Ligand binder design. Structure first.
Ligand SMILES: Nc1ncnc2c1ncn2[C@@H]1O[C@H](COP(=O)(O)OP(=O)(O)NP(=O)(O)O)[C@@H](O)[C@H]1O
Ligand SMILES: [Mn+2]
Length: 410
């Protein structure tokens, strides 16, 4: 049966998960016609759309922090979530109530008529509706997957960004950097800045930009940055020097400053520095504890692992103990392989559900590793073992981090 405005959010989620979307027509037409019936295409006068393999969420949160510190009204749509669906929509930096979501979903359901929608299209229309009612200055949309045919690409953005390009998957057709970049570049718009924060950009992105007439601004061509004792960013003759080091990856803060620069939004020095000092996201190199250092990071492909490994380097005797759980879909071998550079002891756990790999399915790739019943036990063991100079890193998937967030109820 169909949920109502007054139904709990869990009943909506249960309903959207059970949609029979296998046969529905591929492409933006369905979701776009629904958005048009409900007038949801312009949720705020200023819209930024952020695509990429890794770094979308922390880029959007840097933009968010800076824009809030400037006194603007801001909404962020993000995905996926760790513990609660309500993570996906922030207004003024904060989550909304379950009831606001149930009411917004009810409007979407009324307005779609007999037009079918997937889970993510439904969720994206609902976020647009929540932002529209909220009288916002800026809306930042994180792309769900790819871009081109992502539900968020029904909105025309004022600036679009690609944070990075890397492989997040295994046995896959046409699955190369060029193909990947091409999909992501479909969020670009004719006459609008297209920010690419990927330093090794595939040509297909320039091809798509040139075809649309977007203005491409690439890292290491139009703008750049480096770490110093803050860090520095440049776009042509504009320089922002001695910046505070944020609790997000530097590359993504840089892409975020590029987005803001080309947006030509007027923003103060103080907003930028305050936003940067406030920016962070749970599960993204999140230090949960010291002596021993406990870090949660949702890294789940080789590109993130490598970043992670470089990060663990610059927080260094002392051993590195990894609590890992991953999904079967992912490049488990590349990821583990990359992490093995700096990981000393392995604690492998299983993830629930169909997609979720077995502890042995993980250990299969590791010279030696201990195996466990659940993520929480693996994690609690690693913490027992930790000397005060050690590092315990929880990683491999959103779900692995979520268990410890939720076992820690943080
Ligand atoms: N520019 C980057 N380069 C390499 N790794 C990155 C980069 N940005 C983020 N990461 C890594 O990817 C993880 C996810 O960062 P995030 O900013 O949440 O990415 P995202 O694209 O939203 N994908 P997801 O985390 O699944 O929502 C981080 O914990 C890091 O492990
Ligand atoms: Mn994300």
């Amino acid at each position: 049966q169909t949920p109502q405005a007054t139904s709990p959010l869990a009943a909506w989620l249960c309903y959207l998960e059970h949609l029979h979307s296998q046969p529905i027509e591929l492409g933006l037409e369905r979701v776009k016609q629904v958005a048009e019936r409900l007038d949801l295409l312009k949720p705020a006068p200023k819209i930024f759309t952020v695509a990429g393999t890794n770094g979308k969420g922390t880029t959007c949160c840097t933009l968010e922090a800076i824009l809030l510190a400037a006194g603007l009204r801001v909404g962020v749509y993000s995905s996926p979530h760790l513990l609660r669906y309500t993570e996906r929509v922030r207004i003024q930096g904060q989550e909304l109530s379950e009831a606001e979501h149930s009411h917004s979903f009810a409007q979407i359901e009324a307005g779609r008529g007999d037009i079918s929608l997937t889970y993510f299209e439904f969720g994206t229309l609902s976020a647009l509706q929540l932002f529209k009612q909220a009288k916002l200055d800026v809306v930042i949309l994180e792309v769900g997957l790819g871009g081109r045919l992502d539900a968020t690409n029904i909105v025309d953005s004022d600036v679009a960004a690609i944070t990075s390009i890397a492989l997040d998957h295994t046995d896959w057709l046409g699955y190369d950097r060029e193909s990947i970049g091409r999909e992501k570049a479909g969020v670009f718009r004719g006459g609008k800045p297209a920010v690419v924060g990927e330093p090794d950009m595939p040509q297909s992105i320039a091809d798509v930009a040139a075809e649309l007439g977007a203005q491409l601004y690439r890292r290491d061509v139009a703008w750049k940055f480096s770490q110093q004792n803050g860090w520095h960013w440049q776009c042509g003759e504009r320089q922002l020097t001695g910046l505070p080091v944020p609790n997000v990856p530097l590359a993504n803060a840089a892409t975020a400053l590029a987005v803001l620069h080309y947006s030509e939004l007027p923003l103060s020095d103080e907003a930028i520095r305050q936003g940067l000092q406030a920016a962070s996201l749970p599960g993204r190199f999140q230090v949960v504890s010291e002596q021993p250092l406990l870090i949660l990071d949702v890294a789940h492909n080789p590109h993130a692992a490598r970043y992670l490994v470089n990060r663990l380097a610059q927080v260094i005797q002392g051993k590195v103990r990894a609590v890992v759980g991953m999904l079967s879909d992912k490049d488990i071998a590349g990821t583990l392989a990359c992490l093995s550079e700096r990981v000393d002891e392995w604690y492998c756990a299983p993830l629930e559900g169909p997609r979720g790999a077995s502890a042995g399915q993980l250990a299969e790739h590791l010279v030696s590793a201990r195996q466990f019943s659940d993520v929480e036990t693996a994690w609690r063991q690693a913490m027992q073992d930790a000397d005060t100079q050690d590092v315990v890193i929880v990683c491999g998937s959103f779900h692995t981090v979520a268990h410890v967030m939720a076992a820690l109820h943080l």
